């Protein structure tokens, strides 16, 4: 069962890859939120102190 066997395990390995794909891509995306937030959170201070 050489061919189809290893092909199926490569299939499943691919699947594992895509779950990794998500976790990483949207972990970056979610970090973007507070990445933004801190900016304006300093910014209103930056505007009004002067």
């Amino acid at each position: 069962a050489t061919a189809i066997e290893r092909a199926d395990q490569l299939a499943k390995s691919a699947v594992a890859q895509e779950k990794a794909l998500k976790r990483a891509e949207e972990r970056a995306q979610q970090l973007r939120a507070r990445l933004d937030a801190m900016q304006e959170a300093q910014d209103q201070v930056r505007r009004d102190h002067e």
């Binding site: 594992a16 779950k19 990794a20 976790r23």
Partner: peptide, 26 residues
């Protein structure tokens, strides 16, 4: 000073917690 390291130590968790799942996948 004591302020300084705390971030890294706390971030260590956030750093460390990463190792938890991706290994667990396999």
């Amino acid at each position: 000073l004591i302020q300084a390291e705390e971030r890294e130590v706390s971030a260590r968790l956030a750093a460390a917690e990463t190792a938890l799942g991706e290994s667990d996948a396999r």
